[PDB]
Amino acid sequence: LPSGSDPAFSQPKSVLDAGLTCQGASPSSVSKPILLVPGTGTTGPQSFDSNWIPLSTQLGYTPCWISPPPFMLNDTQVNTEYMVNAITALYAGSGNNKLPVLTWSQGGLVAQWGLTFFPSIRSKVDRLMAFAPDYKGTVLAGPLDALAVSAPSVWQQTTGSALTTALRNAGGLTQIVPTTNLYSATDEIVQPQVSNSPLDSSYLFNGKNVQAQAVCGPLFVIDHAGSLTSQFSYVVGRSALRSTTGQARSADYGITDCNPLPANDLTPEQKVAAAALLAPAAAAIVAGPKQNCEPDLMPYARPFAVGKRTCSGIVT
Amino acid sequence: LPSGSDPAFSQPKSVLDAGLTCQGASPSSVSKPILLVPGTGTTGPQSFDSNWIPLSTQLGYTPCWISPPPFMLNDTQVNTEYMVNAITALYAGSGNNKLPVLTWSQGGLVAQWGLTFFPSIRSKVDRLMAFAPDYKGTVLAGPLDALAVSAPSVWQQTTGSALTTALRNAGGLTQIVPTTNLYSATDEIVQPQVSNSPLDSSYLFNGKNVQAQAVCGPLFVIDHAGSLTSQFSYVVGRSALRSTTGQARSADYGITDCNPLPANDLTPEQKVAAAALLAPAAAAIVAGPKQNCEPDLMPYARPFAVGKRTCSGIVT
Ligand SMILES: *[C@@H]1O[C@H](CO)[C@@H](O[C@@H]2O[C@H](CO)[C@@H](O)[C@H](O)[C@H]2NC(C)=O)[C@H](O)[C@H]1NC(C)=O
Ligand SMILES: *[C@@H]1O[C@H](CO)[C@@H](O[C@@H]2O[C@H](CO)[C@@H](O)[C@H](O)[C@H]2NC(C)=O)[C@H](O)[C@H]1NC(C)=O
Ligand SMILES: [K+]
Ligand SMILES: [K+]
Ligand SMILES: [K+]
Ligand SMILES: [K+]
Ligand code: NA
Numbered sequence: 001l002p003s004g005s006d007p008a009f010s011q012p013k014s015v016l017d018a019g020l021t022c023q024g025a026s027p028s029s030v031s032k033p034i035l036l037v038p039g040t041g042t043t044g045p046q047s048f049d050s051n052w053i054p055l056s057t058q059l060g061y062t063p064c065w066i067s068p069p070p071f072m073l074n075d076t077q078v079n080t081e082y083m084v085n086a087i088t089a090l091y092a093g094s095g096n097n098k099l100p101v102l103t104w105s106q107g108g109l110v111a112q113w114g115l116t117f118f119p120s121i122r123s124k125v126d127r128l129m130a131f132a133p134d135y136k137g138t139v140l141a142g143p144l145d146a147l148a149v150s151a152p153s154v155w156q157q158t159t160g161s162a163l164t165t166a167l168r169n170a171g172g173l174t175q176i177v178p179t180t181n182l183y184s185a186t187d188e189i190v191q192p193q194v195s196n197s198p199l200d201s202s203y204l205f206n207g208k209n210v211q212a213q214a215v216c217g218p219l220f221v222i223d224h225a226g227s228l229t230s231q232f233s234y235v236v237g238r239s240a241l242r243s244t245t246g247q248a249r250s251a252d253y254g255i256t257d258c259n260p261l262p263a264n265d266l267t268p269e270q271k272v273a274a275a276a277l278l279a280p281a282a283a284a285i286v287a288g289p290k291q292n293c294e295p296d297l298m299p300y301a302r303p304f305a306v307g308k309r310t311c312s313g314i315v316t
Numbered sequence: 317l318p319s320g321s322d323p324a325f326s327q328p329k330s331v332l333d334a335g336l337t338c339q340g341a342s343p344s345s346v347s348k349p350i351l352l353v354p355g356t357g358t359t360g361p362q363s364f365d366s367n368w369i370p371l372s373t374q375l376g377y378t379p380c381w382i383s384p385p386p387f388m389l390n391d392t393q394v395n396t397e398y399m400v401n402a403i404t405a406l407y408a409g410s411g412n413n414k415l416p417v418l419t420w421s422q423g424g425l426v427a428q429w430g431l432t433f434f435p436s437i438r439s440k441v442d443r444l445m446a447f448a449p450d451y452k453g454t455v456l457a458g459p460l461d462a463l464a465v466s467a468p469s470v471w472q473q474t475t476g477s478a479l480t481t482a483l484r485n486a487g488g489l490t491q492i493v494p495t496t497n498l499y500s501a502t503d504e505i506v507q508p509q510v511s512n513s514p515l516d517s518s519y520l521f522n523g524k525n526v527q528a529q530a531v532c533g534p535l536f537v538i539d540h541a542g543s544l545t546s547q548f549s550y551v552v553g554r555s556a557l558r559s560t561t562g563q564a565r566s567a568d569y570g571i572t573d574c575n576p577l578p579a580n581d582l583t584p585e586q587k588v589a590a591a592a593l594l595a596p597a598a599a600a601i602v603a604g605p606k607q608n609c610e611p612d613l614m615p616y617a618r619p620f621a622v623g624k625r626t627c628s629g630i631v632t
């Protein structure tokens with residue numbers, strides 16, 4: 001696991017700060033922040049307005065989020081700069097108090113990439129609650145890559161990519177801070193997820209790895225978006241957020257919570273938007289960037305993916 | 317459309333027969349046969365053991381398949397002899413009753429080549445259910461082969477080929493029996509498929525042409541193999557097989573069926589095998605025969621591709 005200096009950011013501070021917002025507050029002076037990191041094809045509000053922005057507010061946090069442009073479709077490594085900058089800011093802005101990070105989809109990969117390569121944030125994040133994280137990527141992006149209809153970050157989120165290779169070889173498939181990963185065998189976006197084991201894309205060694213079918217039964221069905229928005233997900237997320245260990249606890253949820261529909265505390269109208277969470281993501285992918293190769297690794301990550309091929313050639 | 321005698325077989329009938337197998341039945345005495353025609357780089361079992369063999373069984377059919385050697389890599393015109401012989405056999409063996417044909421990839425090109433050039437089988441095929449058929453071939457020169465260093469049937473499936481030209485000029489891009497074509501914009505092997513129109517390689521005039529994204533949305537992703545194996549594909553195929561019209565019916569499927577993962581009725585082990593369909597087929601193509609020209613058209617097809625080039629020169 002890297003333990004030296006932080007890499008320098010490629011983006012200026014003005015740019016990174018512009019991508020961070022808090023509800024009703026400035027990052028420079030915020031009470032009990034939670035940092036929300038969005039999924040592929042979305043802004044922070046698009047991922048979370050119908051779900052964890054109001055739910056976290058009801059738990060007493062001030063939700064804050066990043067929106068790396070365009071819609072989380074550019075280089076995951078740059079998406080991570082937004083996250084690292086935001087944790088630094090929000091920690092300073094809330095009294096040097098550690099804060100939680102809550103993610104969907106790629107946001108969890110971004111969080112873990114940041115924790116792996118930017119040691120400074122490890123003391124600033126108290127826990128990670130990741131919904132449907134793709135730490136191994138997804139095999140399902142393969143045809144899109146072959147067709148050259150994949151955005152930068154979609155290439156990076158393909159199983160076997162240089163990015164996912166680097167994360168693994170740097171030690172990033174082991175939890176770094178207390179981590180809960182909630183995911184589903186029936187996720188239609190991220191696979192493989194079926195095994196309830198380290199083979200799954202969402203699994204981290206020493207983490208609290210919650211495959212919904214383990215709790216709720218193998219026949220249980222909960223999709224990629226539902227993995228973020230469901231009542232089951234709310235109970236698990238609340239467990240993680242409240243737990244003194246920094247991980248969800250099996251005592252905190254069971255069969256009575258195995259409701260895949262949008263969280264009960266959401267208003268009717270929020271439930272409608274939550275259920276429809278993935279539509280705007282699909283439309284952003286559709287209009288968004290597309291290329292025929294995986295973006296290059298930044299220098300700090302190259303040693304961890306020697307021999308993989310990116311846009312510029314083979315990593316040496 | 318051609319309307320006379322069937323072309324003579326180039327292969328002995330014993331050889332053709334030996335390539336036909338049914339599950340649990342002789343072709344001479346079979347209950348409700350369905351004939352399965354595999355994709356390039358596979359035998360019948362390799363295409364269908366994880367999918368339409370069990371899925372058709374559960375629908376009450378006896379699955380039967382052909383396995384033209386080696387692995388569907390030889391002349392598509394010879395592959396078609398196996399299909400024509402099998403239809404003749406299974407029609408008689410089911411009491412002189414027409415039977416459905418269900419195909420993947422090249423198998424659909426084979427079925428339509430047979431229906432176009434071998435008139436005797438038209439009255440013996442109840443309906444055709446083709447998954448990812450490449451009636452126009454493909455424009456994508458994939459990464460398996462050096463350009464123009466390819467197997468016989470790979471040449472023939474290249475857009476612009478003499479074979480695909482002949483099919484078109486003989487009238488074979490119009491359905492001959494009731495046909496449903498299920499295909500995907502995100503097919504990484506066969507393109508173009510993106511338009512939901514007669515541009516697409518899988519489209520037949522007067523057919524029931526089902527591009528999955530037209531139903532499911534633009535980021536519904538199923539690949540060339542997923543076109544055969546997905547739950548969405550199963551719902552459409554079941555509709556096609558049951559329909560009184562011989563074609564799938566839009567009433568039978570909709571957004572709720574839009575699951576790209578392997579068909580729900582497959583066991584956990586069959587789903588893993590279905591999701592792994594493509595890689596060993598691609599490896600069989602890589603390991604297979606290579607030549608530097610397209611196989612010659614048989615005499616009965618030449619007049620429909622005059623001016624195209626095969627191994628013996630420009631067709632006359
Ligand atoms: C998208 O990611 C790329 C790649 O990391 C960013 O482009 C780099 O930006 C740095 C900072 O200016 C440059 O030094 C490199 O030359 C850039 N590389 C490439 C290939 O262009 C880019 O800034 C990111 N875009 C956004 C909107 O964040
Ligand atoms: C593969 O296809 C070629 C047709 O392209 C077949 O070869 C022909 O076989 C007939 C029947 O014996 C011969 O009369 C021809 O002279 C052959 N032509 C060529 C170019 O060799 C061949 O039999 C097929 N192989 C298999 C295993 O089916
Ligand atoms: K700001
Ligand atoms: K304040
Ligand atoms: K507790
Ligand atoms: K019709
Ligand atoms: Na399940």
Ligand code: NA
Binds near residue numbers: 292
């Ligand atoms: Na290039």
Ligand code: NA
Binds near residue numbers: 597
């Ligand atoms: Na094979």
Ligand code: NA
Binds near residue numbers: 477626
């Ligand atoms: Na040719």
Ligand code: NA
Binds near residue numbers: 583
């Ligand atoms: Na099984």
